[PDB]
Amino acid sequence: MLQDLFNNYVILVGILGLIFLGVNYFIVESPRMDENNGNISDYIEKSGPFECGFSSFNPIPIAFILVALLFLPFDLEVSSMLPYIVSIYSVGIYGLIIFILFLLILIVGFIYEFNTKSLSITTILHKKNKALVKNLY
Amino acid sequence: MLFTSLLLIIVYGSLVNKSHLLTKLINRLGLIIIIYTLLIHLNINTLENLSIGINMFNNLLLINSFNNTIIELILIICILYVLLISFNITGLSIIDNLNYSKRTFIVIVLFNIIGLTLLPLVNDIMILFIIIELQSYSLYLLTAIFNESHNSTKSALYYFIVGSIASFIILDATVSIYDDLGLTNIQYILMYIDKLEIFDLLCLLFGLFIKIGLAPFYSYSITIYSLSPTIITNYISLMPKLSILTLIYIIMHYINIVNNTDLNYVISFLILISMFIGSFGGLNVIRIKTLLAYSSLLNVSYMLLAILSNSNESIIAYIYYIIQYSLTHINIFSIILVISIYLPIMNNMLNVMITKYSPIEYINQLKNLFINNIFIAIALCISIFSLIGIPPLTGFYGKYLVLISGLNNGYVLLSIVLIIASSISTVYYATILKVLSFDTLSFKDIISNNLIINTSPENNNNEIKPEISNVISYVISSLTLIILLIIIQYENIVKGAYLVLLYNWV
Amino acid sequence: QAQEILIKANKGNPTGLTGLFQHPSPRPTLITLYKATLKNLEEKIPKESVYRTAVEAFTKERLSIVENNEIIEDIEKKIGSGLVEELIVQANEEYDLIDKMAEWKAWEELEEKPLDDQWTYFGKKL
Amino acid sequence: LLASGSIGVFGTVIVGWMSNSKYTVLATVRTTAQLISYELVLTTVVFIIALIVSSLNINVIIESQYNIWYIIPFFPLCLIFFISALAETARPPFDNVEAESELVSGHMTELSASPFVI
Amino acid sequence: HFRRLMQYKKGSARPGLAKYLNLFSLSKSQLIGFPVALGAFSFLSHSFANLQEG
Amino acid sequence: TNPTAFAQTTRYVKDSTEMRTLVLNLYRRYLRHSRGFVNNYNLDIPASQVRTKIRQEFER
Amino acid sequence: EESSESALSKATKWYLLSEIFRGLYITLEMYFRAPYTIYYPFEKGPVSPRFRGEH
Amino acid sequence: ASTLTKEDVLTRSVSVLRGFEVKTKDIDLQTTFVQDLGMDSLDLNDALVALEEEFDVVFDDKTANEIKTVGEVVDFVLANYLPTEQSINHTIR
Amino acid sequence: FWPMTFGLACCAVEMMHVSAPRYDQDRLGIIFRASPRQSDIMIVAGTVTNKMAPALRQVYDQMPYPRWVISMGSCANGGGYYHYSYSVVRGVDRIVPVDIYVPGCPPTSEALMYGVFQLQKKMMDGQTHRMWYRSY
Amino acid sequence: NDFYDVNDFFPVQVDGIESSLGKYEEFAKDAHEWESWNLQNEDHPEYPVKRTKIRHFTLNFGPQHPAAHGVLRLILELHGEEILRSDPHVGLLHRGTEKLIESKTYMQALPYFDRLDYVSMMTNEQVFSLAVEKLLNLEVPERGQYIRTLFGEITRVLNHLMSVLSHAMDVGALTPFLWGFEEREKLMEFYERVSGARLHSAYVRPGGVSQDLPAGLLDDIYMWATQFGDRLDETEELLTDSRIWKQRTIGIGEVTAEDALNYGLSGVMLRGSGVPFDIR
Ligand SMILES: CCCCCCCCCCCCCCCCCC(=O)OC[C@H](COP(=O)(O)OCCN)OC(=O)CCCCCCCCCCCCCCCCC
Ligand SMILES: CCCCCCCCCCCCCCCCCC(=O)OC[C@H](COP(=O)(O)OCCN)OC(=O)CCCCCCCCCCCCCCCCC
């Protein structure tokens, strides 16, 4: 109850954010002071990418993309258990049995991803070997 | 029965190795699961005891003798459908190995069957918006089952986007009704049927109209059906209409309590346009799946005329129509999946590219079917003739009963248009029949060992080796004679339609 | 005649040295390949080529010692050229050389004669 | 408290985005796939504690540990919480976001002066 | 008409946006042709109704 | 071991005519990458200039 | 089937981080030892009579 | 699809050929390259590469020593013209 | 004082031994930063070959102002042992401006610290904001 | 080619395409607009797909990386996170030592060898001292060869501390790096007492050593030996049995003994593969 004190805190952090932005624009010495060689926009050499010194010119695997997609179901499962947390008492045994069913259905989803090895990054593009066999004629 | 064994198949599916023999046998277990569901359902559900309507699960689901029949219809069509993947259709491994590669094909079907059957039974908006998603998602997953294909994936992406828009339209209407009344259960809303904004139920139907592909939303359904593999299009072009046309009928039953004149005109505007587009659309097309996609739009147009009229003759007309069009749709797509073995082979012109997903794609690939397999062609001709409406095939009574309900309620304009669109459509059903037989005698003397079926080795050259599988040929034969010989049992079957009740009582 | 001799296996028990799996049935397979070596000499390499005489001086010696000894350990110890798996490699790659050496005709006269100054280092003759 | 944690997760993935592509965008699919996954384990641990007190109020959670400290019954959770606490903040050993030997300065190789301080 | 004009400049190198905007691309005369026709239809319809009492 | 992009085995060619055709293809390869050399190295000279200099190199 | 430590014994070491906690403790030993650091330029490191420096 | 026809290649081919030192300004299908235009190795390569830059078709090593007329190049482009694959944004939206 | 780990040659061993527990550069507030953006100093230690000199200029030009360069060892100062080599820059001062030269081969770990201290004594003599008031 | 690139089902002969309102050719000049009239399916393996050869992500593990022990432009071509091809670019430190030695005497060429490996000094100059001794046909006396054996070992400890701990540091274990570097400071004291300079000890000259051991050096060398024995133990505490250290290294970079010989590997990366060969 009564969040006026929290509201002022939210305002203060927002105001404090601009102070992080603005303090640099005032404290730093101007370009002419250090070497004057050029502005940030003009100094393309400095205002450029870093590639260990030498100039150069994310197709991520299926698993990494598959782990991210599977986060959406499992996160909705966990975030839908919130109603049971604040009402674990009143729903009594009936809620507890329903709750376990609501997980056992989702365990089958957990079981299914376990067997197919969908999470593993997998290494099929390489690491192949063969046994040398003489072919006498 | 579905829920208990679907989880068993999901766990068992990944435990065994990925082999087309183990996948096919697992597909048969899908057939056994569906068969048991039908026996268990028929055992406990009867038309006599469901006439009143029996609330279930805290009044979330309500089942009566009308929704009960469609559930039995949905299960039976699925049994015939799974025979397409649980058994060989052609026999040649090249074209049949597409049905055995994906293990989760049957699992996704069983996910959709649970969604299909529960959708007509929804009695609350909270469970309506859920059950429509359980069915809708199962369609998008099904359309993308073959992820190596480029067309199948692009079909599902196009299907996902439009289906999500339809879901949002459906969701928005239910929220609007909730905002006016504050109630959720449909039976509670029926008390306030005279004080809610009736068009919000129309906005609800506009969402359901998109999912079944009604004009002006027809554009995507034709594109999607013409692109997905023939094994996929057979299921996504028929099943969603079985479980949504029934839901539309139940909502229309509620709406006719007030008998809003403005609402009929708007829906009649869509019905009138659909017959135009569904008839003139297929005149200039070269693809067989695009033609049947336009045929589906026109036969959805005919059924919606019965639903809009919504009287005691509509139940008789809609129940009979939905059953007969379903078997005929199964019969045609069963034949098109089998007559792919007579295709010629080159040894070029137009550089026509035929992929293993849709071996039969153009209408002119049915040439000389009267020569190659005359009995199959007659089955195809009979199925085509039913859609035309040649009496006494099952198709004729479908239009006869729709016209009775349409004219009984004063839909004189739509009835005359439905007939004209029936005559216009006959042009592009006769084209299929022209392709099959009209050149039989000019090609009676032909030298051709260049068929796909001729690739198989000769096993013994003495024993008689049938060209087609046993099960798939028997389904075509069983469905062909049902359409042709319905005249015998029509009076009794229509009596079975009299007993179907949706709060008629007395 | 279409035959197949297992040179090195691709699975099983390690043999200390990495990437060198234990050969399933080495002893007769060593005897077979050793015998096939002597057949190759009789078809390709001339008599006076001391390379031909040098192959038999140890192929017959080893192959005879393999047959008498029935323990895998005793085959290595008396031959004294490492493991049994390695002994397969030594016999196999030597067999190929008999094919290649005959192709080169390395029994003939010096093909290319060096110039006068080529092999003299800093003026003083080596 | 958990919702504000999610915003900072989304705040970090902005760092390696569209500012060329040398080292920040290499550690942004890597970063995002890390603090997404452990945000599941961190979130579950919090809810299990809140399940024991049946409250989502931190004061109630603190005041309900008078006779017992949840380090005693829930010792595994404290390890799991701390492991997830480390990975969410990207601190080592789970420090492949700014993998110094692999990605120079990681995602902060472009950042300098005030953007680095913040 | 103005709304679709704004879409052309959002992206034009894309064939798809230009393709379907051509379907809905009313001409200059059609912008007067239709409101005149639809307007004249409603005036002529009612005007003949009054004399014919229905 | 896997050799890098645009690699060729070092071979002592024993034909006068084959070397003529090898060179001719090579000169086209430089001209094909004329646009790239400008964009890769950010050269101040346009694409036609590089081809002009490459031609001055090959003519020489 | 040929492992000396039973399944429970290996699981407890695995789940309870036995070696990491030992690794932490040994590091904590060095926290109570005198650092080697000297204070330049107030102190210098050792030099030898053979040191090679400024010509 | 391949929208280039034979005339379209022929019409735009001359403009590139009008941009290089050619003995005669009359060039059609029958016109040669080495003979009519007096082009040697290095001279002819620039024009052949130039048509690669406009017609966007790559000529291989097999045809290198087998090019003798300008009609062949015009007909070659049609047999070897494809539109570059468009990203998911351009294709469907 | 955050230099950049630009160790190139045998001089780089001494630059590590300053961070070692005996000397502990960290006590003085010295934390090496790999990226040029985060590093305000650049201790060029070791031979600067011709093959490296163009790359060295790219690394130097990316340091935001203010920036200092320390040349440690003989190779970085004037060529050192390899002064007469066909592929050795004879003194890095041909490429980047230098603020202090540490002599040695390699300079002892204290010699680098002494070179760091002298440069620190220069930085404390900076008069930029007074220069605006009085010299500008 | 260089800039871009371009079956199971039967090749099916279908000709005579017709619609219900004419033939294929009657409406051919109009069907390009009709996307449902196209005759080129997109799933066909022979369907013409012309895609430019966009090069794979080639990160530069370049000179300005702490992992680099110098200036190494390691051009790594990777798809995703796996390693496809690696082409190290050595030469960024080619000082031309082999060219300079040809113009300097045998005594003046010794200090060049301490600058080859920054950490293993007295072993480097030992191989040139042995080379000259072999040619000179003169043999170092006994006490000379014992000093080279003792400082041969101390150098190996100095080198391996740089090798193992930086390898541990590059993985991420910062602490063992600093524990060992104090020992290097303690070991470099021994170098400075005998030769004068901490690192580059031009001590092992052809024909023995430079100067005799200072008195009491053995006492200080031995005293370090007793204390040093524990230093390995703590190093093995945070590395040897740690599960994170095992995961990072076990099964990483597998080199067969037969294949190690093919590339001419020697040292630890030849006994790591099982070959029990040692030059000593
Ligand atoms: C005696 C018994 C006989 C029974 C049948 C009697 C009625 C038959 C009616 C036929 C009369 C028109 C047909 C012939 C006229 C030619 C039409 C035509 O070709 O298009 C002309 C015009 C564009 O001109 P153009 O494309 O250049 O064609 C030149 C051809 N000389 O393009 C146009 O003008 C097209 C006009 C726009 C289309 C309007 C469509 C509205 C609906 C028309 C009826 C369709 C049925 C609707 C209800 C069923 C479906 C719901
Ligand atoms: C700018 C205003 C936009 C209004 C949009 C209205 C939306 C709903 C339209 C209902 C029909 C849905 C059709 C799908 C959207 C229509 C797309 C469209 O309007 O584009 C125009 C289209 C292409 O025209 P085109 O000549 O090829 O290109 C001109 C370029 N300068 O030309 C067409 O082909 C469109 C016409 C499609 C055919 C519709 C016919 C419906 C039935 C009408 C007759 C009724 C039948 C019964 C009649 C007797 C009973 C009363």
Ligand SMILES: CCCCCCCCCCCC(=O)OC[C@H](COP(=O)(O)OCC[N+](C)(C)C)OC(=O)CCCCCCCCCCC
């Ligand atoms: C009921 C019991 C409840 C216990 C709850 C706690 C469980 C914690 C995780 C146990 C499993 C595990 O750490 O596993 C180790 C995993 C996976 O190892 P793996 O892929 O299986 O390889 C091992 C294969 N084996 C079985 C053959 C050996 O990787 C790791 O090294 C993770 C290192 C985590 C370091 C975190 C440091 C934080 C310190 C916090 C205090 C300062």
Ligand code: SF4
């Ligand atoms: S100055 Fe001496 S120690 Fe430093 S890099 Fe050069 S040779 Fe090595």
